[PDB]
Every structure is written in C-alpha cells, then in structure tokens.
Amino acid sequence: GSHSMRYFYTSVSRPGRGEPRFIAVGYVDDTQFVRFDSDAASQRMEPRAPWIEQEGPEYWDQETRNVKAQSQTDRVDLGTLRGYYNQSEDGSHTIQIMYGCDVGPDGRFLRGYRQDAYDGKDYIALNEDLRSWTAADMAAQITKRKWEAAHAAEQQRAYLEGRCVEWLRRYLENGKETLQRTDPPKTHMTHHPISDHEATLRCWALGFYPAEITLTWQRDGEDQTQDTELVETRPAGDGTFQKWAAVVVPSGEEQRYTCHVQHEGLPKPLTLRWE
Template sequence: MVTIVPVLLSLPLLLGPVVPQEAQAGRYILTYLYTGLSRPGEGYPWLQGTVFLNDQAFFHYDSESGKAEPLGPWRHIQGMKDWEKESQLQKFREGIYLETLQDIMAYYNDSNGSHILQERLGCELQNNGSRGAFWKSAYDGKDFIEFNKEIPAWVPLDPAAWNTKKKWEAEEVYVQRAKAYLEEECPGILQGYLNHSRHILDRQDPPSVAVTSHTIRGKKSTLRCQAYDFYPGGIDLHWTRNNEVQGSESAGDILPSGGGTYLSSVMLEVPAQDRELYSCHVEHSALAQPLSVPWDGRQ
C-alpha cells in the first residue's frame, strides 16, 4: 500500500505545480491537473497529468509511459529540469492517486464501477509579491476534498472524504507539510521555472484578422470576423456600422488554436442589400492601436 505521508515528506517537488486560464499581466500560475480512471479504455492510460505555466502546457505525465515529458517550447530549453527525476516523482504520485481512488470506491462498495478522480493543485506569484495557492479534488465530477492552508486542514466535501481526511491528517506534521508546500515550496519551484519561461509567458502575438460574408436566399447576409494566431488570449472583437457598435448575433469563445495561440470570431446579420460601412473592430494588447477591418460587401 502506498501512502501519501512519506511522499509528502521526502519528495518536495512531487505536488508541484478551473481549468488553467490566461494570467493577468504580472501574474504567473503553476497548475497540476490530474485525471485518473478506474476503468480506462484499451490503450488509454489510467492516470495522466498535465502541468501548466499560466495557460500553456508545460509538461505531461501518464501511467502508460511512466515518463514526464516537456511540451511546446519547453522541449527546446536545456537545463531547466531533470526530467528523469520528475518522472520518478510523478510515479510516486501515481501510487498515491491509485490508493485514493480505490479507497473511495471501497467506501461506496463499487469496486467494479467506472469512476473518475480529478485533482487540481498549484500556486501563483505576482510581481507585487503576493502569492496564492490551491489544492482540490473531485470524484465523478463532484467536489471531493480540498486543502485549506489557513486552518490548516483537509476539508471533506463528500462523505467518503472523511476517511481520506483521517488518513492524511494522521499526524500534525503531515498537515504542516502540505501547508509548507503550498506556501513556500511551490512558489519557489514556480520562480525557478520563470527564470527560463518569462519570454514565453510574456510574449505578445498580434492577431491576424479575416472578414467574410455569406448571403442566404438573397434576404440577409451573415458577416463573420475571425481573429487568429494571437497571444495572450484576451481580445475585444465586435462589429461597427458607420463607427457605431452593433449587437452581435454570435460572439464566439476565445479558443486555443494550436501552437500556444488563440482564435475567436464574431458574427452579425445584416440586410443583403445593405451597403453601409461595416467594420470589424479589434483590440488586443499586442496591437499598438485598435484595428478596424472593413467589409466591402463582396467578401
């Protein structure tokens, strides 16, 4: 049986760095996301984890390969991390995860069911010196347990979590160890990563913009403005008519487009014969000034 206690005490990097989101300027977040499946499909690992720096995937681990491997631009940075050591740490984490999942299933007397255990933990640093941290798990899509570093204690959010709390709080030192990780070790790890990563996380990629239209039955035209290949993800995208802002029929989400950039689009319905000046207005931090791309009625 693998227990969480020795791992927390002897492996300070293990529980290192919702859904990861784009951080505000001067704010950096290290996030570990784990997903464990009690009955994975063929060829699918029962546990996999992805580590993010802000909204960028930094490295990945899964139980099938047993390896922690850098992702994206971090694949090309030398000397940032000992990946063999990280793989060993993640392997220990895998044992903890399996035991926790089995304990929950045993509590509910459902050892043959298909279940999912998820965990999100990490910390953040801001340029003004402030810090933050988080550590929370969910079972079958519902909150299970979280660590409150102010008490400090594990807070059960599910009946089965009381047993987990008892095990993880067997001695006070274990609670203090978790608190120290969130408040001291994790921020230190994040700061070390930033020494190699600020140029990636602070970059500014301006959007490319395309304006098109589609006419249906000669009655209405749907104008579409798409911005793509921009970073960071925050963007203001809307239509104007003779410089007046128009309500959009469809303002799309900001979505990852691959390669660490984003895309978004906004649509507007207008009369097919309308020849007023419509323009797509774009504001993004990488643009020196707002961009206005006109629709000429023929695109």
C-alpha cells in the same frame, strides 16, 4: 505581468482492464513543459518546452519518483472512494487533481490553489487561507477529517507559497524569450450570404498568445448579444491560439455592425467593419 504554474493529474480506472490510466500535465501560463503518461514506453517525466530540456538528469529522476508516487496513491484512492460512494467494482472512475501557484508582476506569491474531483463533479478543495479544506459532500468529509488529523494542510501551504514560486521564478528566467511573449492577434472579417435578405459576418483573430482574448460584436457601440455565435479559444498547435465571433445581420446593414478585439499584446483594442 502576472504568471501561473499549474499541474493537471487524471487517474482513470480501466474496467476491461489494467493499471489505472494516469496522465500528468504541467503548464507555465498556457504553455506545456512536462508530460507523464502511464501507458508511455519512457516511464519518465518528459520535456515539452526548450527551457526545461536544459535541466540536469538528477531533476528528471526526482520528478519521475514524485509523479510515480502520485499515480500509485491515486491508484489506491480509486479503491477507497468506491467504498465512500458504495459503488460497484466493475465501473470506470476518474480522479482529476489540479494545483498551482501565482506570481505577480513583482515576482512574489499572489495565489495558491488545489482543487480535486471525482466522476465529473467536485470532491475536495483547499481555501485561499491554505489552512482549511472544503468537502463537496458527506463522503468527501471523511477525506477532510483524515487530512486534518495528519495535518496535510501544512504540507500544501509549504509547497504552494514556497518552492513552487521559487521554481516558477526560475522557469520565467530560463525561458525569458518563450514565456515573456505577448503575441497580438491577426484579425480579419469575412462575409457570407445565408439568405436572400440576411447575411453572416465572421470576425477572426489568429496567432495570439496568451489565449485570454475578448471578441465583442456591437451595433452603434451597443453590445449585440442576440443573433451571435462564439466558438471557444482553440489551439493552433504551434504555441498560439485562434478564435472567431459570428453575427447574423440583415443584408445592407453590414456597415452598422462592428467587431471589437481586446488582448494583452495589443496597445489599443481593434475595431473591424465591413466595406
């Protein structure tokens, strides 16, 4: 099916004190493969996948240079954005940058993206056309005009619809055993009495990949939204994910309720009921 390569950069200025803390993380779907920390002893691009450990020593040194250049540019960017927003020098600020390409079931390019942020909120984005920019405010408009004059939108489209897809197709072949997997969830129901006239019904789903899963509670096939608690898809730490949906039911009415589990790895969605 579809696939996605992604990069996440986080440049935080230490107010007390040092070089701006820089974390670079690389993913292929919901799987990490590269790592770069500024406070690390290595000072190199580090592998976090078995199919990337088989890459030449010339590769690991090129990645280190590009990521080091990206960090030092972000180091001065923090010092330029403090002027655009007329903020103090004794403040900690964050520059979160994300970009990536998409590959369809066929193999060819589908979506190209770049989203940049400052202090939680959005800053500048690269559109679906990959030729125009989207500034969040009047301060970010200066960055848009600077990137339009330098014709930086062409360097982005070159790296997104080419090379990114050329290396993502290479990554999907080098790791055709690790990434092409669709682990279906291992579901189960638990029942805990909360009151002398009401009880909680928890529906589990463990060991699934990819993280995208739908846990839906129903009462007579009718989607139960009220009296429902849902937790965010959590990592297992072994390359799989976990999720649960709980529902508060009147005691004796356990049988009326039903939990539906939808996932890529399952051929037909599950239906769990209490006995």
